[PDB]
Each structure stands twice: as C-alpha cells, then as structure tokens.
C-alpha cells in the first residue's frame, strides 16, 4: 500500500479544474511524496509488467462545509505531459496546484506532437483525438465527493491494454483524476482547506524479464 499527498482544496479553485495521478508512471517521480520502495525498484530491473490497481481518496469537511468533487478512472489519458512533450516538474506542480480547464484540453489541441521541419508549410492545428469532455466524465467508473457525505474513494479496475503486456517505462493505460464539481464553501472556524490524500494498490502482478538496473538513454 503506497500513499501520497495531493494539493489542498481551496475555495479559490474554479469548477471543472482537476489533477491526476498516472499510475504506475507517478512512481518514477514519487508523485505526491510516495515511495513504494519495493515495486518502484523492481520495475527497473524488469521490462514487462501486467498488474491491476486499487485506489482510495480522503477529504474531511465539516458540518458547515459544502461542495462537490468528481473522481473517476479514465484510461488511455495523456494529460500528465506539457504541450511541448515533457512531463511537468515539481516546481510546476507546486505552482499550478491544479489543472484548469482550457479550450486546448477541451479540443485535444495542444497535446504533444512532432514538428514537421523546414520542408513543410506550418499547418494550423485544430483538433486531436485526446480531447476532454468535462460533462461526460461520469461514464467511466467514478464516484462523487459531497461535503455532507464524502467519506472516501474506492475503485478496482481490471487490467487493460493494446497487448497482454507492455513495457513498464512507457505503458500508460490507467489514470486517476479528481474534478471540482461545486466550488468549496464553508463558514470560518471549522477545518479550512482540507487536504486530499490518495492510496494505491496493485493486484495480481507478473513481472517479466531480468537485467541490471535500467540506464537512461
């Protein structure tokens, strides 16, 4: 059981804003101060993996709090990278504190791409296949987080993939995201800006291969 800390909810957060934890990729950066300690390194000495997942969330509001949060498991997402094609840094995470909605994400416009070069004219990018539909997020496995009854999160997604197994350093078919349904509000005096904590558990893994610790290209 690995546990991690996310950024704390504030009333300043707009609606449809979000943040996500792409498993198992977040482990490499120890996202949210998480260190599995065993699996994290075991992946390095292997190449192919096939395992499930099991997650959880927590956020303590109080009698005089109100708000709504959306949590769901969206597969095959690619929102954990900057438009150029580089993953964000810890400084960038601490700065943003949240992912705000934008037409770019709504349209899949600014997802990473290869520059054509000097041979071609500059095309006008208009759309992409990894758009984000804010309203229809509820279709995938999900739950609500209401300040009056938000207890915790629970989910268990079976394995998925274009092939029975994939490479660890590249595979990304499952991802956890949280969305702010109703902006947080409350009377002063009770718990202010409650923290959000996440837990992750793999299930029935099968590590494959053997070699020395993976070396950067």
């Amino acid at each position: 059981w690995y546990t991690g800390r996310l950024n704390s909810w504030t009333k300043a957060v707009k609606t449809f804003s979000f943040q996500a934890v792409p498993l198992p990729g977040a482990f490499l950066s120890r996202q949210g101060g998480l260190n599995g300690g065993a699996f994290t390194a075991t992946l390095h000495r292997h190449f192919l993996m096939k395992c499930g997942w099991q997650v959880q969330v927590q956020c303590n509001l109080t009698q005089f709090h109100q708000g709504a949060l959306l949590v769901a498991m969206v597969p095959e997402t690619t929102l954990d990278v900057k438009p150029d094609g580089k993953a964000k840094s810890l400084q960038e995470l601490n700065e943003e504190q949240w992912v705000e909605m934008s037409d770019d994400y709504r349209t899949g416009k600014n997802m990473p791409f290869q520059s054509l070069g000097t041979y071609y004219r500059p095309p006008n990018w208009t759309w992409g296949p990894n758009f984000i539909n804010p309203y229809q997020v509820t279709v995938f496995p999900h739950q609500i987080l209401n300040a009056r009854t938000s207890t915790s999160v629970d989910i268990n997604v079976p394995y998925i993939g274009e092939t029975p197994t994939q490479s660890s350093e590249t595979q990304n078919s499952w991802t956890l995201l949280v969305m702010v349904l109703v902006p947080l509000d409350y009377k002063e005096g009770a718990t202010t800006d409650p923290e959000i904590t996440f837990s992750v558990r793999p299930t029935s893994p099968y590590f494959n291969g053997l070699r020395n610790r993976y070396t950067a290209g």
Partner: protein
Amino acid sequence: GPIPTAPRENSLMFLSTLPDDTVPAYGNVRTPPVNYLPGEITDLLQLARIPTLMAFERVPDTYVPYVAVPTQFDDRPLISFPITLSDPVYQNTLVGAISSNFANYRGCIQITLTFCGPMMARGKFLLSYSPPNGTQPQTLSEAMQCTYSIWDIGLNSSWTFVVPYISPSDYRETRAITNSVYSADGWFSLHKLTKITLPPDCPQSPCILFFASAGEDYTLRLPVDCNPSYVF
C-alpha cells in the same frame, strides 16, 4: 451447355450499401486471440443507459451542470425546459449525442436529480410535466393541473423522474427543422413547494444537480451521416 447469358438490367454499377461481400485478397491468415480484453460492447444502448450530467448557460460563455436553490420566492418554476433533444441542454449528453445520429427515436426519457447543501436544512419540492399547448405554463397553480409528483427534502436525495412516452404516432422526429406535433412534446418543470429551513451558522445557497438517461424502451432508427462541424 454454353453460358445462357441473361443480361442483368443495371449491372456495372457501384452502390454504397450493397450488403454482399467481395473477393478475398490475401486469405489464409491467422490472428492473435483477443479474449483477454474485458468490457465488450454489443449495442450503443449500453452507453445510452449510463446517466450523465446536463448543463445550462450561467445566469446573468460558461455553462453550468448545477443549480442552486435561491432564497427569493416566486410562483414561477425555478428551472424548466422543453423535452426536445435538439435543445442545447442535451447538446452534450450521451443520449443526445447518440440520438443526433438517427432519424427518429422511440421510448421514454429518464431524469434524475441530486441535492448538495447543508445539514440541518429541510424543504419540499414539486415535479411536474406539461404536454404542449398554446404556451408554456407559468404559475404553479396552472402546472398543478398537469401531471405532477411530490419530492421531499429529507426523505431521500434523488427522487428519480421519468417522462412518459406520449405521441400520436409510432416515433418522433429526432431533430426539428420546423416545429411540429411529432417533434416537440411540451415541457418539464420543477417548483419550490415551501420555504426551506435555514439552521444556525450553516452555509447558504444549497446546490442541486440533474442527470438524464434513456429509458429501458428507448430506441433509435434510420441511421444518417453526422455533421462534421465539431472539427471546427
């Protein structure tokens, strides 16, 4: 014997929806079994059944999937709309999107509501449906004559609602080029029955959400080609 050639009336033609097959090109192929993938899909009804969240333009470009109960009181309904899939309110729901790719539909429409507010507050709500007439009803008195139901705040938090399928035909127009009897089916509205309770030191302006889904008898027909506008 020799080919008793019987010439065909209109051969040497290309047809878009010809059902029969054609000549194989590179037969004798083998494929990797795909039984390991779960979550198989059979028909679009599987996705059409799962509910989703509608939205409305912000009260005086940001649509909102929630509504908050106001402190002010009036006899008019707080939120209402026509039951017509072409309306913007359904313009992003899964049911609306799927229906947009068909000539006509058939079956009931299912609606769900959810509350999000304080602890020690209570109230009452009235749900109603009104078939088409000269103009949309305005007063709760006029609405009361139509079909309605009572939803208590405190009994439960989601008093599911379904609009019965009523029409003088077997189907109805998915899109309405011109207003017609078979296209529009009146409106649906919600009315605040009584003033809600404001307990000590609790926040104000509770929040309510609405969800839509296709009924068990929902069915489409006559597929068509899509509008490619969304690319722009």
